[PDB]
């Protein structure tokens, strides 16, 4: 039965944790909006081998996930859960969190994402050979851009993306349920205080993030079966652990 002061202290703790682990400051991403890949640079990316483009993207994704791991480490209540449950939650939620975080680096006006120093369209990623997945991820970021999340809202929402008591394999489900509820109280309190409860009905359907993650695992299966040695030799060990079957 967390008190109002405890709920308020949770809001602050979650928001602080996100600030410390956000990977790139929002202002930096916004400042870079006019730095867009040229037609020649786009073509250069498109003409990369499938293996090199997958390898680059796997490294960048691993980097982004490492920040999400640090977010969880600092998240009030997460370290209180048993070791098994920490693992279950991060293994399922890490990628979901990255997909939400991406909207900050997404410019809806020209439908570009910040990638390797400049903004580029989904055409940048053609060499991967998973255009449907990329389009679905860009559609997802475009949908989130319409919500106009503040930094604090992203912090509170990504905490809830991670603390999801519906994941199978939890040893202490009721403990996770209790933390989830308190984080829900923290989110809703912050939203009520800022007149932003209207966003709740517009948040992605919960099956959405799961679906994007399954699609990503499936596209890696297609790539890995075609280039198994490249993945074994060159891909980050954390990436394989999280995503390979």
């Amino acid at each position: 039965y967390a008190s109002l002061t405890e709920i308020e202290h949770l809001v602050q703790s979650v928001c602080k944790s996100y600030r410390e682990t956000c990977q790139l400051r929002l202002e930096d991403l916004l400042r870079q909006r006019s730095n867009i890949f040229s037609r020649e640079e786009v073509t250069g990316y498109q003409r990369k081998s499938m293996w090199e483009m997958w390898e680059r993207c796997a490294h960048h994704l691993t980097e982004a996930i490492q920040y999400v791991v640090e977010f969880a480490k600092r998240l009030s209540g997460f370290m209180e859960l048993c070791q098994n449950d920490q693992i279950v939650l991060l293994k399922a939620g890490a990628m979901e969190v990255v997909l939400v975080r991406m909207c900050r680096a997404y410019n809806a006006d020209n439908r570009t994402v910040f990638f390797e120093g400049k903004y580029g369209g989904m055409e940048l990623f053609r060499a991967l050979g998973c255009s449907e997945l990329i389009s679905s991820i860009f559609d997802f970021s475009h949908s989130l851009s319409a919500l106009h999340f503040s930094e604090d809202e992203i912090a509170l929402y990504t905490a809830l993306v991670l603390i999801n008591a519906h994941r199978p394999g939890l040893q202490e489900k009721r403990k996770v349920e209790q933390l989830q509820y308190n984080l829900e109280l923290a989110f809703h309190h912050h939203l009520s205080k800022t007149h932003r409860q209207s966003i709740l009905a517009k948040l992605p359907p919960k099956g959405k993030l799961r679906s994007l993650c399954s699609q990503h695992v499936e596209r890696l299966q297609i790539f890995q079966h075609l280039h198994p040695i490249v993945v074994q030799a060159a891909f980050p060990p954390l990436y394989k652990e999280l995503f390979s079957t």
Binding site: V69, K73, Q86, I87, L90, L238, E241
Partner: peptide
């Protein structure tokens, strides 16, 4: 696991 290591 690696997640275990990264978490301590």
């Amino acid at each position: 696991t690696l997640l275990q290591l990264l978490l301590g």
